[PDB]
């Protein structure tokens, strides 16, 4: 993380589409280095669903400038997650903060 930022590090990491953000809120059920399984909260469910969202992170791939792209998870096993949080920091992100 940068020690002296401008508070705009939070908006650029989320909106760039390089992190994995939660659509619905709930409790994290299982964390791997590749996938993240999240159990949806009760009121944020739809009446014909099973209520599990599965995020599949993308491991070591190739960018256009021949650099790395790698998404590591940042949550732990069994902790609550609200809507719009950051579940997986990408290449230059750090707890949802841009960090070059």
């Amino acid at each position: 993380k940068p020690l002296v930022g401008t508070g705009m590090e939070r908006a650029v990491a989320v909106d760039s589409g390089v992190t994995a953000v939660a659509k619905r809120g709930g409790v994290v059920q299982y964390v791997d280095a590749s996938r993240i399984v999240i159990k949806v909260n009760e009121d944020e469910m739809y009446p014909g669903e099973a209520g599990i969202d599965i995020y599949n992170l993308t491991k070591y791939t190739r960018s256009n400038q021949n650099t790395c792209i790698n998404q590591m998870p940042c949550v732990s096993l069994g902790e609550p997650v609200e809507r719009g949080d950051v579940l997986a920091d990408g290449p230059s992100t750090d707890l949802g903060e841009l960090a070059l």
Binding site: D32, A33, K59, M72
Partner: protein
Amino acid sequence: TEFLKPRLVDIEQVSSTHAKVTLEPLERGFGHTLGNALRRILLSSMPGCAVTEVEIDGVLHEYSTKEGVQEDILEILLNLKGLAVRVQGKDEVILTLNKSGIGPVTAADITHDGDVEIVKPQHVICHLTDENASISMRIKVQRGRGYVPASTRIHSEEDERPIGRLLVDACYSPVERIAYNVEAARVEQRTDLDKLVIEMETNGTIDPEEAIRRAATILAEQLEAFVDLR
């Protein structure tokens, strides 16, 4: 006007790592010459032990992932570089790690022999998340001096090592940082004598009574080429 010679007078342990050693007495000039010729050697070359090769089964290279662990295997290699061991009898050992079950994999879970002793058992290596998932690795520890990168070791070998034996960069030196202070010594008649308080900070794989003896053995060996041979 003949001289006065110092002596290793006091050693105290602030913590398991932090130490503070004093030398007394010194003359005027030598209090600031030995205090700088003992920092420039204790930071550069001191023999310690470090992790060199890690071999986790089922995994080919260091740029993949294993099931049921939180980190990538490259993060496990970055965690295994900061491991403070102490090998006494031999000069190279192989340690085994076995773990199965939900929870972290601390450094205390390594089935050690009688000679090696992991001095910081609260270290964190991995994180297991599934019940069926497990991990198993063999870890080679050598003895060295200075900093030896991975490209030098892969360039200076010729036998074919099998696919899977990952290489870790090795930082061998135990001393992290070191400062020294020179205060007025407490001598009753020779008033202007000095004392030298070397303030050492390391990890738990060195002894401050031994580090100054090594760092002065080296200095009395390098000056042996100046005292007789011209």
